[PDB]
With several copies, the nearest count.
Chain A
Amino acid sequence: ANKELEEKNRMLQEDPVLFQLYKDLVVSQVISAEEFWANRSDIIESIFRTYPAVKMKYAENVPHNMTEKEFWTRFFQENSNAAIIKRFNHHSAMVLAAGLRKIALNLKKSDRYYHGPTPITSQDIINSFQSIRQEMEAYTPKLTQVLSSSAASSTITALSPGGALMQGQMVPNDIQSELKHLYVAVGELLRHFWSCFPVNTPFLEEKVVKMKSNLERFQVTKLCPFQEKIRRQYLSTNLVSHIEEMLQTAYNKLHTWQSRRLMKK
């Protein structure tokens, strides 16, 4: 069955971003689209599941020279007294059948938390203690001692934007959407490329897919710089270099892990 074709038809226009990115991976003819998907009323229904007799009657009386309104009409249509009780018993039983398908912790080192990840003679204490004890025999010098005009003016100049302690562009708009779309594409493909990269996966069938994805990295990064070139030759302003870091770091991880694999071998 063409289940893949049916799913592609379903998502062709319902979701714009998914199909946009999937098509983009083919617009420049980067790779085959197989890997894309390889890696990644109520009343009538209730009666249908409730009454098997109604199911059989529907199968035998499928619309043929008749009308669904007439079929609806056929639905509602001491001997009768006991029939009602029997009908409730059977109907509740049918509904129920349809719903019934066939360590105390101990530690040895706690001061490590007291000094967490945050990083970092005797007569001196005596001298400082006595000196500070004798320091404050006089109090309330506020009248002049606390502040002076020259120091205050220096402080205000420092607080000025050009002073110390106080150091002090949305021009492009349409480029924003293009950058967002490119970032989404990079994320989409990096997701699969990094899906199993951190895990060692020392198996043949597991490593085959990482090798294929690593080649796909080369093949996608082949086309990325061409769009980069198109965008660059406009004004030579507001450089977009963050995208380069992702590609270069992915390449560095790829090559370093390749060297590590060779060393392990």
Chain B
Amino acid sequence: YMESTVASWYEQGILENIQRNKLLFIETQDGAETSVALEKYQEACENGRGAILLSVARGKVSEGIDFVHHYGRAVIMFGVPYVYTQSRILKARLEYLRDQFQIRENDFLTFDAMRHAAQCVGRAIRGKTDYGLMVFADKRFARGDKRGKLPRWIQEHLTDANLNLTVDEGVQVAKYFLRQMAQPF
């Protein structure tokens, strides 16, 4: 899915504009390329060029890496993280949970998505009270079930006013929030 989206953006002019605005780095399955790309991403973050690191939620990089102040400032989540519905291993794992312990298949699937999203979006608040915003570009997260299964600390901060902001409105509120966080305590 990441490759398809990247290819579509490349065919259109959006990707070139993104490249002009800020450097772009992408993740790949091979660990060596992942490590090199992340090493360059750190230097880009240190410098004023900036960087946009595209990765996969299930990618080992997402779990291994930890984002701190001036690292992964704004965490973008493109789509709810769901595993493919064809891998037969998950079919056993899921239908057995339905049969025993009485967990609905949809319930467990949404839980597996929300837990993974929280894992991959909760890094920006590592410590030392370093500001940062987590934007989820998916109307599915706006659903009550996803919000309810979301961790309490994120959900309570989340409000109905900004629950389903348009793209432009989200951009404006992000700019304003960054303004507020820029100033000292």
Contacts and interface: CB of A to CB of B under 8 A. Distances in A.
Interface of A: 81-82, 84-86, 88-89, 92-93, 95-96, 99-100
B23 A92 contact: yes
Q: Which of A84, A89, A92, A93 has the most CB of B within 10 A?
A: A92
A80 to B, nearest CB: 9
Interface of A is mostly: helix
6 contacts: A89-B25, A89-B26, A89-B28, A89-B33, A89-B37, A92-B25
B6 interface: yes
B49 interface: yes
B107 interface: no
B142 interface: no
Given A96-B44, A100-B43, 20 more contacts: A81-B4, A82-B3, A84-B3, A84-B6, A84-B7, A84-B10, A85-B26, A85-B28, A86-B28, A88-B10, A88-B19, A88-B24, A89-B28, A89-B37, A92-B25, A92-B40, A93-B36, A95-B23, A99-B47, A99-B49
Nearest to B52: A92
A79 to B, nearest CB: 12
Contacts of A95: 23
Contacts of B49: 96, 99
Interface in B30-75: 33, 36-37, 40, 43-44, 47, 49
Contacts of A92: 19, 23-25, 40
Nearest to B54: A85
Nearest to A99: B49
Nearest to B36: A93
B23 A96 contact: yes
B32 to A, nearest CB: 12
Given A88-B26, A99-B49, A93 B6 contact: no
A96 B43 contact: yes
A96 B3 contact: no
A111 to B, nearest CB: 41
Given A95-B23, A96-B49, A99-B49, A85 B43 contact: no
Contacts of B3: 81-82, 84-85
B40 A96 contact: yes
A92 to B, nearest CB: 5
Nearest to A80: B7
